[PDB]
Design a binder for this molecule. Structure first.
Ligand SMILES: Nc1nc2c(ncn2[C@@H]2O[C@H](COP(=O)(O)OP(=O)(O)OP(O)(O)=S)[C@@H](O)[C@H]2O)c(=O)[nH]1
Ligand SMILES: [Ca+2]
Ligand SMILES: [Mg+2]
Lengths: 177, 696
């Protein structure tokens, strides 16, 4: 029963927790509650082998900058997340998350995850973004960012529709074995 | 004592130094029944701490502070106006006053530590937490077994072997008898181990044939009625205890282990003594050379000792004060002319101010042995007391009680929450190697103190120490605010020459007894003799849990562990006991022969015969059964002043557990005597089955 420690990081509100809850319970959270720290598990079959997947949820709020890293020791794989409809969270992948993860775990595999895929083509969100002088992050951008931080994989998904969701965790597992 | 929901719900903290330099996120909780304080790491791994093992809780500035720079940074401690002090929590645990473990937690939220510290301590210090019935302790075992699961969410069979280590064979056979997997590397589904399956498992592992004999005398509701009125004296029970209007032997076992059948008159554990009598009319829990953690000549001194003794209700502590060297000129506390380490006088004051009234609201006496031959440092001493103790310090006599001849001392109530300083206010001088040479064996450094200057003198009122001259001299002066201190040797000598006057002296004034200088090993002297004479401050070395301290902790647990016990009215005004040691359960973690000793501590005219059980029939320690005749203590004159000692030892004399119980607090009948450690803390596994009978 091979165990794997997967830590999920990224700006606050990018959808990290919904990512974990939707994946482990196939249910989507009904109330947004900022995370301090949490843990979820899941036994999964990957390439014909049972794996005990430990999912470590972290705080996106910057008030936890010194405390957050306390969950990093012995991490097998990191999921750096950013919202596909939040250029700010995308920029922080390079300005904050990548450097923070590499500082504490220089050799640990990283998987870049673009979240809220369902909203990229959503009309309401776009108008809202246009009013904010913004626009969604495109796949080519995501892929390019992944190359820049040396991510083993770039993956987009939606916790809401679950499209691309399971793939994220299968790859996270395969990045370790 | 009910466990508040938020405690069981849990709170997020960062536990540090559980390793070194390692800070670990955890969710801290107290199970619904108040048995354990346990934290869960992100990896799901759990760590348990018995509520009964906790000695204190601290938050804010009183919490332990991290030293390593790494942790200092993690917690932003070197940051201007941070809020670290609003997040610190420290839980102190340990088998005694010295062997301590500090569990340090830092919360994410602000101000939650205070609630946790106060609520957890209230559970710990609740009299009924330590004095629950046998069934409660057996239940703590079950809760533990079912709470400590593996990754598969099951109970490892290995955990049963660790819980009941004396004989694996018998444990294996017990699991099998309950159709459960017997096998180093099996796990049991928790739903397969509920009550009464656990109960059946216990009955199989620990058969109770002696209880079957009680039946020889099922059991109808009528018989049970006869039993309770004849044996346990001076239908709902059957429904509650019978596993399946008849009571089976197993049902009898659980009933006898239940709360309705307590060996103690539990109301006695609560603060119920009349606290309005004069101070010298009470026995006062006292500590000698409090600052020492070991050894009188070699060993370390620690301000923490003050916290520990005070948290147990000690009301009289000692501070040996010595001058500090320049450039600081800071007074210190140590055992002069030895190799014991030093602590600053100031830290002792800070330790005392913190813990003084956490577990008892009644007055404390600070016995100063002053060797500070420096008016400036003595002024520093007085200053530290006034400023740190603040309003707690009694700086002047009470209006209703002037320091005049014929006036009695105030009562514990009149001095509630007050700290009294015992210091000189007569020969004085500095000690010499030679001067301590011929005192070392008796009075020690206490044999000579320096003169008290103005600053310190002003702080003394109701506890003025003067060298003893004679009982008639004392009676002549008629001053109730003067205290006389004697070594165990001097006090014993006085009892052999003037017992009548010593007894009368204690009705008017205070006498403090302390160990002879020859006890460099910090051993203690038996206190009974002195309490019998009315001596109120019988100071012992709290760091040494030998018999005298075993009895001291036991008797002062009563009256709400306030540290005060009202003397019998015959000591203030100006029955036959039989115990049969029947059997014992899980007495040792290993299979060894065991024996029990029973004796009485009381007045000179009380029964003095001592009893020792025959060795247990074999190395079976799970359920040994003895064949002893009743151990009798005839004509106990004053039950109030006497206590019964029941101690369990394994062959070879290693202490396993005991109970020392004042006679008036004992209930009669068949009982499951839950055993305590030397420091009087409740033990989970060991217990004795006994039969008590009181007659006039
Ligand atoms: N439309 C859509 N909304 C999503 C999706 N995933 C998350 N959200 C929404 O995003 C908001 C925040 O998501 P959440 O998972 O709580 O963020 P977080 O990163 O865990 O935030 P923190 O814990 O660092 S502060 C919630 O209101 C949630 O409903 C998604 O895939 N699609
Ligand atoms: Ca001394
Ligand atoms: Mg969240």
């Amino acid at each position: 029963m091979q165990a794997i420690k997967c830590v999920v990081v990224g700006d606050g509100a990018v959808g990290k927790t919904c990512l974990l809850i939707s994946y482990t319970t196939n249910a989507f959270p009904g109330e947004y509650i900022p995370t301090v720290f949490d843990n979820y598990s899941a036994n999964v079959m990957v390439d014909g082998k049972p794996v005990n997947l430990g999912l470590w949820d972290t705080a996106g709020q910057e008030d936890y900058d010194r405390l957050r890293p306390l969950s990093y020791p012995q991490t097998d794989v990191f999921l750096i997340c950013f919202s596909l409809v939040s250029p700010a969270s995308f920029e922080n992948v390079r300005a904050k998350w990548y450097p923070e993860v590499r500082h504490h775990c220089p050799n640990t595999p990283i998987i870049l995850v673009g979240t809220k895929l369902d909203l990229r083509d959503d009309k309401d969100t776009i108008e809202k973004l246009k009013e904010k002088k913004l626009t969604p992050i495109t796949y080519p951008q995501g892929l390019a960012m992944a190359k820049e931080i040396g991510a083993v994989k770039y993956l987009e998904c939606s916790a809401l529709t679950q499209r691309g969701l399971k793939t994220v965790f299968d790859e996270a597992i395969r990045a370790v074995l | 004592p009910k466990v508040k929901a938020y405690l069981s719900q849990g709170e997020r903290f960062i536990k540090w130094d559980d390793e070194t330099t390692v800070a670990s996120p955890v969710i801290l909780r107290v199970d619904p029944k108040g048995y354990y304080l346990y934290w869960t790491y992100q990896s799901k791994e759990m760590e348990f701490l018995d509520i009964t093992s906790i000695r204190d809780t601290r938050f804010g500035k009183f919490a332990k502070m991290p030293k390593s720079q790494k942790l200092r940074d993690v917690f932003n401690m070197d940051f201007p106006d941070n809020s670290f002090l609003l997040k610190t929590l420290t839980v102190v645990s340990g088998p005694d006053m010295v062997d301590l473990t500090f569990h340090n937690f830092v919360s994410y939220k602000e101000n939650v530590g205070k609630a946790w510290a106060e609520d957890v301590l209230a559970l710990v210090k609740h009299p009924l937490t330590a004095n629950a019935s046998r069934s409660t302790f057996l239940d703590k075992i079950l809760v533990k077994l079912k709470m400590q699961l593996n990754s598969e969410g099951k109970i490892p069979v290995k955990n049963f072997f660790q819980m009941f280590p004396a004989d694996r064979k018998r444990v294996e056979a017990a699991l099998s008898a309950c159709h459960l997997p017997k096998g180093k590397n099996d796990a049991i589904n928790p739903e397969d181990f509920p009550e009464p399956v656990y109960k059946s498992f216990l009955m199989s592992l620990c058969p109770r044939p002696e209880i079957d004999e009680i039946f020889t005398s099922y059991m109808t509701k009528e018989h049970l009625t006869k039993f309770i009125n004849q044996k346990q004296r001076d239908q709902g029970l059957i429904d509650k205890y019978e596993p399946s209007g008849q009571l089976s032997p197993e049902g009898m076992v659980w009933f006898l282990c239940g709360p309705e059948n307590s060996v103690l008159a539990q109301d006695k554990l609560l603060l119920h003594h009349d606290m309005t009598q004069p101070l010298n009319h009470y026995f006062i829990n006292s500590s000698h050379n409090t600052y020492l953690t070991a050894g009188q000549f070699s060993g370390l001194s620690s301000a923490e000792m003050y916290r520990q003794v005070l948290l147990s209700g000690c009301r009289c502590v000692e501070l040996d004060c010595w001058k500090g060297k320049p450039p600081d000129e800071e007074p210190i506390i140590t055992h002069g002319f030895t190799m014991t380490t030093d602590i600053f006088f100031k830290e002792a004051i800070e330790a005392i101010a913190e813990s003084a009234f956490k577990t008892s609201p009644y007055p404390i006496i600070l016995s100063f042995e002053n060797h500070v031959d420096s008016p400036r440092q003595q002024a520093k001493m007085a200053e530290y007391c006034r400023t740190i103790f603040g309003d707690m310090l009694l700086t002047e006599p009470l209006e209703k009680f002037p320091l005049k001849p014929g006036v009695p001392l105030p009562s514990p109530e009149d001095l509630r929450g007050k700290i009294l300083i015992k210091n000189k206010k007569e020969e004085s001088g500095n000690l010499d190697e030679e001067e301590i040479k011929k005192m070392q064996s008796d009075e020690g450094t206490a044999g000579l103190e320096v003169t008290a200057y103005e600053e310190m003198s002003s702080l003394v009122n109701y506890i003025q120490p003067t060298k003893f001259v004679s009982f008639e001299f004392s009676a002549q002066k008629n001053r109730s605010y003067v205290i006389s201190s004697f070594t165990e040797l001097k006090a014993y000598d006085l009892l052999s020459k003037a017992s009548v006057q010593f007894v009368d002296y204690n009705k008017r004034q205070m006498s403090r007894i302390y160990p002879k200088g020859t006890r460099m090993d910090s051993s203690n002297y038996m206190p009974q003799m002195f309490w019998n004479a009315g001596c109120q401050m019988v100071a012992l070395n709290f760091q040494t849990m030998d018999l005298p301290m075993q009895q001291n902790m036991a008797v002062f647990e009563f009256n709400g562990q306030s540290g005060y016990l009202l003397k019998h009215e015959f000591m203030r005004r100006p029955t036959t006991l039989s115990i049969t040691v029947i059997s014992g359960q899980f007495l040792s973690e290993r299979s060894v022969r065991t024996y029990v000793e029973v004796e009485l501590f009381g007045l000179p005219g009380d029964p003095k015969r001592r009893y020792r059980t025959k060795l247990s029939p074999s190395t079976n320690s799970i359920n040994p059964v003895w064949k002893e005749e009743p151990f009798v203590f005839e004509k106990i004159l004053m039950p109030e002043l006497a206590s019964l000692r029941v101690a369990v030892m394994e062959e070879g004399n290693k202490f396993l557990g005991h109970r020392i119980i004042p006679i008036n607090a004992l209930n009669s009948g068949y009982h499951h005597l839950c055993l305590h450690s030397e420091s009087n803390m409740p033990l989970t596994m060991p217990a004795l089955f006994i039969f008590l009978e009181m007659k006039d």
